[PDB]
mmCIF file of C-alpha atoms and ligand atoms in Angstrom:
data_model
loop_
_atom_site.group_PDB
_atom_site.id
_atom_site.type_symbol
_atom_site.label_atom_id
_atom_site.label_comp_id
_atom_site.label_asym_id
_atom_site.label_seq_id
_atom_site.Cartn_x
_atom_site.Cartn_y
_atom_site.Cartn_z
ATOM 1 C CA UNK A 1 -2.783 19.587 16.856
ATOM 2 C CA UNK A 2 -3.283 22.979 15.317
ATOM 3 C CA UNK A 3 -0.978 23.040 12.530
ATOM 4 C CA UNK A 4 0.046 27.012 11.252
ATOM 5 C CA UNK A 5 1.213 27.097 8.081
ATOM 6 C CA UNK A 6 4.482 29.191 7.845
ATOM 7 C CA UNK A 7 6.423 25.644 7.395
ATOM 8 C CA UNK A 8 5.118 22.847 5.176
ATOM 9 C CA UNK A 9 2.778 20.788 7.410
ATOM 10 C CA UNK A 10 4.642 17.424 7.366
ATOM 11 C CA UNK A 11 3.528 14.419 9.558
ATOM 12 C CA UNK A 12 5.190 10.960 10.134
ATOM 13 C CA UNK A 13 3.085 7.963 8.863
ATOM 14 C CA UNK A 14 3.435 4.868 9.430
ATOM 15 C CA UNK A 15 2.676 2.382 6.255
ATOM 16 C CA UNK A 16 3.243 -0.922 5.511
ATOM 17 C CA UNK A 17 5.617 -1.534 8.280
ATOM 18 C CA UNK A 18 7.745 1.925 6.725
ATOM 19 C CA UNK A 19 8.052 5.034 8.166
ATOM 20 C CA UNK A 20 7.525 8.074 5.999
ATOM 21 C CA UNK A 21 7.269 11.761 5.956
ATOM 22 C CA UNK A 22 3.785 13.148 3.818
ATOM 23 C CA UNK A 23 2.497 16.282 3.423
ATOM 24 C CA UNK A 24 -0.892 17.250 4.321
ATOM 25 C CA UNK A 25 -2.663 18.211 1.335
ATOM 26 C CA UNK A 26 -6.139 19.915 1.519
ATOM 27 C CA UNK A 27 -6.247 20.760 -2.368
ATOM 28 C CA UNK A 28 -5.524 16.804 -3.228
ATOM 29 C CA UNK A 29 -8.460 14.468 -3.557
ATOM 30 C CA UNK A 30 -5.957 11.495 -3.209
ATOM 31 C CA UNK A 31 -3.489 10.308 -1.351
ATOM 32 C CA UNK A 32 -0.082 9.597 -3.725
ATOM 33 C CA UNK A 33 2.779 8.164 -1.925
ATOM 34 C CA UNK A 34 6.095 7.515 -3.650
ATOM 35 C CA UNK A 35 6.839 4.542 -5.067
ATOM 36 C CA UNK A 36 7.534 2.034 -2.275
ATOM 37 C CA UNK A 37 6.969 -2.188 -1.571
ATOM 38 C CA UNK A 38 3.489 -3.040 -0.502
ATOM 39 C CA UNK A 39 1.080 -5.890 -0.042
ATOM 40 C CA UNK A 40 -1.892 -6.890 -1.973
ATOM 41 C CA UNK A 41 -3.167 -6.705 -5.243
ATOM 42 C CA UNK A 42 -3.692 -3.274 -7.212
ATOM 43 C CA UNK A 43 -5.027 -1.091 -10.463
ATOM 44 C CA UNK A 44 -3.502 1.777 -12.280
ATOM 45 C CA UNK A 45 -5.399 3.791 -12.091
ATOM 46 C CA UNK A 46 -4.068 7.774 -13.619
ATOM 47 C CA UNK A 47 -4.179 11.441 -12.085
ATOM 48 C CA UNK A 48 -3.890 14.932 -12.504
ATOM 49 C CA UNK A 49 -1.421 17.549 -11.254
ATOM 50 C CA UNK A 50 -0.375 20.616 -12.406
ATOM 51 C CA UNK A 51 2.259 19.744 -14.741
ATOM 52 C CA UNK A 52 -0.030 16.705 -16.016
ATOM 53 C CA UNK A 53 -0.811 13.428 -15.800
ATOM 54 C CA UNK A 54 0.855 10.324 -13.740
ATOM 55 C CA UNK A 55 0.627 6.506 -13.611
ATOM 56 C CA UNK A 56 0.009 5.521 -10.390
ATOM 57 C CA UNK A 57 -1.238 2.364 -8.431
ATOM 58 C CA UNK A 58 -4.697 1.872 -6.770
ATOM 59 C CA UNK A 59 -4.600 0.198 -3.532
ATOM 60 C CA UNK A 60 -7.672 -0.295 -1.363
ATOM 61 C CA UNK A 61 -8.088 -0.944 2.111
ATOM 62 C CA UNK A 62 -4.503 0.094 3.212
ATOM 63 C CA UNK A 63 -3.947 1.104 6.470
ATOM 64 C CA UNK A 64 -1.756 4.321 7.410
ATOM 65 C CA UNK A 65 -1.371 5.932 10.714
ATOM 66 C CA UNK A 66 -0.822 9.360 10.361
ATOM 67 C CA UNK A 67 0.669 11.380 13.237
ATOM 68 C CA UNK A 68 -0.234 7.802 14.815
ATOM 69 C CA UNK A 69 -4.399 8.394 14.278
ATOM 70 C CA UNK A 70 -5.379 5.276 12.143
ATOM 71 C CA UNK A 71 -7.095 5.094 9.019
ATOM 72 C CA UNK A 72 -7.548 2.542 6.362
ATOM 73 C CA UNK A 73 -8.351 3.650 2.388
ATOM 74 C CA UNK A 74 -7.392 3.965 -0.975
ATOM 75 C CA UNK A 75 -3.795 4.862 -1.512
ATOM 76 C CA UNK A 76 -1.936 5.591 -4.679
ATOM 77 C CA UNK A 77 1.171 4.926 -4.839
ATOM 78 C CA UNK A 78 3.292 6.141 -8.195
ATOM 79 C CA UNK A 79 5.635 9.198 -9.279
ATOM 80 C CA UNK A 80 5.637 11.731 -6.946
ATOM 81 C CA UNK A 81 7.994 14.108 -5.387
ATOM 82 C CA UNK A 82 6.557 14.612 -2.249
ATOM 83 C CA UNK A 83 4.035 12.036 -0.350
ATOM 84 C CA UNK A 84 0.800 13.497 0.055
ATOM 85 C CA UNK A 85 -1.866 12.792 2.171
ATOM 86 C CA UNK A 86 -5.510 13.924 0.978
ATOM 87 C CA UNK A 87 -8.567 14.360 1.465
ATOM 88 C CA UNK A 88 -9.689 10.780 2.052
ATOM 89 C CA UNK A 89 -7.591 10.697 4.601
ATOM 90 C CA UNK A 90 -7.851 13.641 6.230
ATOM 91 C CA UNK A 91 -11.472 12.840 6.788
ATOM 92 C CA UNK A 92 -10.952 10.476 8.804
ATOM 93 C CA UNK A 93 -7.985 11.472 11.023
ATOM 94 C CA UNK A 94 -10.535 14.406 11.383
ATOM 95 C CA UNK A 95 -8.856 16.852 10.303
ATOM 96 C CA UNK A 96 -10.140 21.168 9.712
ATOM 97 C CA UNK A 97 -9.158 24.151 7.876
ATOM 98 C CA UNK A 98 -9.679 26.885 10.707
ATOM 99 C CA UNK A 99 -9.637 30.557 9.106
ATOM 100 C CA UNK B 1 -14.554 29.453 9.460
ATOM 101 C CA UNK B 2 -14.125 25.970 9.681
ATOM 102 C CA UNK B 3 -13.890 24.096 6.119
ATOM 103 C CA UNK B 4 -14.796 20.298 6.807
ATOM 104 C CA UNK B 5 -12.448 18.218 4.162
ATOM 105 C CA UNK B 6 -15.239 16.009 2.863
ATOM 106 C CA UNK B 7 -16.189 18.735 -0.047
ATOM 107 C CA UNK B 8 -13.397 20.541 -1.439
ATOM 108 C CA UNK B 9 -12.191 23.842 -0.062
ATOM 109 C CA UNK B 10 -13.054 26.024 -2.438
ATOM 110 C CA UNK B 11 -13.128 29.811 -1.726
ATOM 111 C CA UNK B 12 -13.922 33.183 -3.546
ATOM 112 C CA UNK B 13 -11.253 35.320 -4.215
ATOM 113 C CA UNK B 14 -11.484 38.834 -5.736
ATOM 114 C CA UNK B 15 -8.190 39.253 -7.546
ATOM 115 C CA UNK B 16 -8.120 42.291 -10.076
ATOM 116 C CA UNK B 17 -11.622 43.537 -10.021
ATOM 117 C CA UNK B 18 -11.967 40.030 -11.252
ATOM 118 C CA UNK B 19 -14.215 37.235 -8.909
ATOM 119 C CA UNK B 20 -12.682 33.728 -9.015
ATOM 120 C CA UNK B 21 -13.315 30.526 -7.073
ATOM 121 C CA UNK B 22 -9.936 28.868 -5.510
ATOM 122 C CA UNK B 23 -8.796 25.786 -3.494
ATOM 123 C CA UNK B 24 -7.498 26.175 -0.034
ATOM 124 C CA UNK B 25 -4.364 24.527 -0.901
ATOM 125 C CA UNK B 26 -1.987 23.449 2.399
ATOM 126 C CA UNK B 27 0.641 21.608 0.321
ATOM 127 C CA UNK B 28 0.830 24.316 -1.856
ATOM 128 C CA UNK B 29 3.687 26.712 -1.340
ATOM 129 C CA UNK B 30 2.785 29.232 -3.648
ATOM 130 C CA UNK B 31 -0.355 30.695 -5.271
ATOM 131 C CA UNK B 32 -0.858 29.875 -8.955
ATOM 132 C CA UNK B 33 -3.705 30.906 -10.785
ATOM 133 C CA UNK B 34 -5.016 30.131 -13.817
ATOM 134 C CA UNK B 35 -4.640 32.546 -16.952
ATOM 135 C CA UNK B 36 -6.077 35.975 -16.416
ATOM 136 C CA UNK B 37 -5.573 39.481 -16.483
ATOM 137 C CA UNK B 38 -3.661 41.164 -14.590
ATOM 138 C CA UNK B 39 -1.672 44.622 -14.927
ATOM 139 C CA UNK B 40 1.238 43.088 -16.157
ATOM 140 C CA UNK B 41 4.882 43.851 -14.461
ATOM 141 C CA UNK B 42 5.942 40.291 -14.259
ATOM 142 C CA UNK B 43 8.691 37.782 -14.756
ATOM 143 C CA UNK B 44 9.102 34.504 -15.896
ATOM 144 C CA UNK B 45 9.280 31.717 -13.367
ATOM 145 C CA UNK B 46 8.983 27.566 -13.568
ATOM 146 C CA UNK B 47 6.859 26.056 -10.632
ATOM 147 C CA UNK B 48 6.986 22.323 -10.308
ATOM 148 C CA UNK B 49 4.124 20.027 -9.265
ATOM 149 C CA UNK B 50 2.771 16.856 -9.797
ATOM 150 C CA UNK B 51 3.052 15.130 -13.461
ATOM 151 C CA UNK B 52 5.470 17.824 -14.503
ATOM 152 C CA UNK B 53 6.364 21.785 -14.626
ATOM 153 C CA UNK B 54 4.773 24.380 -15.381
ATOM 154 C CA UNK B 55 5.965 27.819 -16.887
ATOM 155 C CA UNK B 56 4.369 30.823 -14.755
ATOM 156 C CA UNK B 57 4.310 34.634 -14.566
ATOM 157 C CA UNK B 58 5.270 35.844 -11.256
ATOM 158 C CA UNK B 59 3.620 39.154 -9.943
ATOM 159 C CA UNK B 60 4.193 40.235 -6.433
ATOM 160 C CA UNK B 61 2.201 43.034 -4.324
ATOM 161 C CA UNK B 62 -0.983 41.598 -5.771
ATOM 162 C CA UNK B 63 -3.828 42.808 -3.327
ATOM 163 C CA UNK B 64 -5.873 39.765 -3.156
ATOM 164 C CA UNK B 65 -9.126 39.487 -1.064
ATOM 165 C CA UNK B 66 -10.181 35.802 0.343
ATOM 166 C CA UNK B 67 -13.139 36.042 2.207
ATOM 167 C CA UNK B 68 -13.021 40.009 3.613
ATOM 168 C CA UNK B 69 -9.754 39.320 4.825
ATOM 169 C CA UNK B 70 -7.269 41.039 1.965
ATOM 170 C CA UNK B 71 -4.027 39.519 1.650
ATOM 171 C CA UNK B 72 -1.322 40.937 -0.532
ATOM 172 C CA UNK B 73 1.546 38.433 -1.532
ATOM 173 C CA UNK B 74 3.340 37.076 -4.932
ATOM 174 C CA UNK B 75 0.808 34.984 -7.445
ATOM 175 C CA UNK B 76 2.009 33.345 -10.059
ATOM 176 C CA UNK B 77 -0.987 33.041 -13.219
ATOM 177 C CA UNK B 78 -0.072 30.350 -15.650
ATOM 178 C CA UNK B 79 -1.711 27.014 -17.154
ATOM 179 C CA UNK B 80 -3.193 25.239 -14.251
ATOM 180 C CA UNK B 81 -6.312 23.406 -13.923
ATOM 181 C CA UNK B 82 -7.820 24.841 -11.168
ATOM 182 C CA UNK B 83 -6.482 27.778 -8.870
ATOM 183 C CA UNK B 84 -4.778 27.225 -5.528
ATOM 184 C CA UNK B 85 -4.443 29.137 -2.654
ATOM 185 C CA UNK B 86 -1.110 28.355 -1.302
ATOM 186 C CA UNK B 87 0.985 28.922 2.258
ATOM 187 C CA UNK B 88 2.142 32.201 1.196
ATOM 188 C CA UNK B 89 -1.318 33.307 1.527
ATOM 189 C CA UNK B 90 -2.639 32.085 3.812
ATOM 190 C CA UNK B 91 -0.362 32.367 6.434
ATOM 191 C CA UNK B 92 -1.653 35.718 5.888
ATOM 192 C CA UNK B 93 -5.774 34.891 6.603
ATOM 193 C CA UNK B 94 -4.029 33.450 9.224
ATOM 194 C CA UNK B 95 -5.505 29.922 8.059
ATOM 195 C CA UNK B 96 -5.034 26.788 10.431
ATOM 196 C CA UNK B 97 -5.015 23.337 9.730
ATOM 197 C CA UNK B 98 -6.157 20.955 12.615
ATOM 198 C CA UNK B 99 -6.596 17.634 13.929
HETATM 199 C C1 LIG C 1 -3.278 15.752 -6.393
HETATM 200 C C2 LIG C 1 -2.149 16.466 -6.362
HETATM 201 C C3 LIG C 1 -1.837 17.522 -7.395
HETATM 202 N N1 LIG C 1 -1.467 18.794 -6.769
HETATM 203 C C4 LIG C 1 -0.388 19.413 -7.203
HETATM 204 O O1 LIG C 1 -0.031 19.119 -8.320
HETATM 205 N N2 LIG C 1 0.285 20.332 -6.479
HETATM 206 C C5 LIG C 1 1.141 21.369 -7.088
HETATM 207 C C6 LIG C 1 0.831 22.785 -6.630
HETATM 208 C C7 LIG C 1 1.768 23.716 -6.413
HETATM 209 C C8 LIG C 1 0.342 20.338 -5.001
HETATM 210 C C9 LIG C 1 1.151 19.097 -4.511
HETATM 211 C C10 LIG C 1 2.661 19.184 -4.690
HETATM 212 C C11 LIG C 1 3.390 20.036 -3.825
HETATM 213 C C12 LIG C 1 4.790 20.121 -3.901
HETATM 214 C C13 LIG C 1 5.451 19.328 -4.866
HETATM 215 C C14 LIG C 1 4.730 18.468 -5.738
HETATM 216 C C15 LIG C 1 3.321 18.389 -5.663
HETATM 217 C C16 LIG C 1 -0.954 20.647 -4.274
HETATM 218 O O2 LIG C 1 -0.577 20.847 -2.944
HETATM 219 C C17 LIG C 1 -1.923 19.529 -4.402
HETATM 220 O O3 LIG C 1 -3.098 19.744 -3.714
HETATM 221 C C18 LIG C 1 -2.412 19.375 -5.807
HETATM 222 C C19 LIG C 1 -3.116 20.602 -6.408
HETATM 223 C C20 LIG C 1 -3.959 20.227 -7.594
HETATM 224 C C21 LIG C 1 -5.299 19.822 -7.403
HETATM 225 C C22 LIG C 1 -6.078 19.475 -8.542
HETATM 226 C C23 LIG C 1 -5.526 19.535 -9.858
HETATM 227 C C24 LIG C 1 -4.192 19.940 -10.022
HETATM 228 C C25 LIG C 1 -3.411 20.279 -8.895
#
């Protein structure tokens, strides 16, 4: 859809069988998700915000659907406030900036 | 235009007589810049982000041009790493997101 930008852009994702809310983040390189249960094996892996540095979790190959569109890729899971979906995501669902 | 999310959105902003490059930041709600000058009627404000706070200096009525299209809105100028372009803002070019 054409998202406008007067209210946060939020999306429902589904991951690892959970249901979440996320942001859609153009200016993140990442996606971080909030601590939550998943499967597999995984790094840690560290990254920058403003604010500084957090500890997260690499996981590969995880698959998200995002406003139901599928995707598989890295996700980091870790200390966030918000769940944030970035640009290796947002690649694949497709998505623009339109200005 | 239509930014393409597999290079970062990076724009150039003219902000005080002063030519900066910025991110196109969705899941941003405010513009923070890093340190520069600006005529200086400000006030002290705290924006929070990931990996910590920050401590910012809030101006408002700042003419700021992004792309031709001259926006005037609230930036706050403080220690981050790289500077974001966020809803307040752009609402104002009028950006989209899509998918
Ligand atoms: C990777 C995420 C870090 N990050 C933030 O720290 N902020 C903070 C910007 C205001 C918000 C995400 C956010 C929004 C609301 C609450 C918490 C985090 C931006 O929307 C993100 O793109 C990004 C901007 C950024 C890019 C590169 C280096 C530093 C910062």
């Amino acid at each position: 859809p054409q998202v406008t930008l007067w209210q946060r852009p939020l999306v429902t994702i589904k991951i690892g069988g959970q249901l979440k809310e996320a942001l859609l983040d153009t200016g993140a390189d990442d996606t971080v998700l909030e601590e939550m249960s998943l499967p597999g094996r995984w790094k840690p892996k560290m990254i920058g915000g403003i604010g500084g540095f957090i500890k997260v979790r690499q996981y590969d190959q995880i698959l998200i659907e995002i406003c139901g569109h599928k995707a598989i890729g890295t996700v980091l899971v870790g200390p966030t406030p918000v769940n944030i979906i970035g640009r290796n995501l947002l690649t694949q669902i497709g998505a623009t900036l339109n200005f």
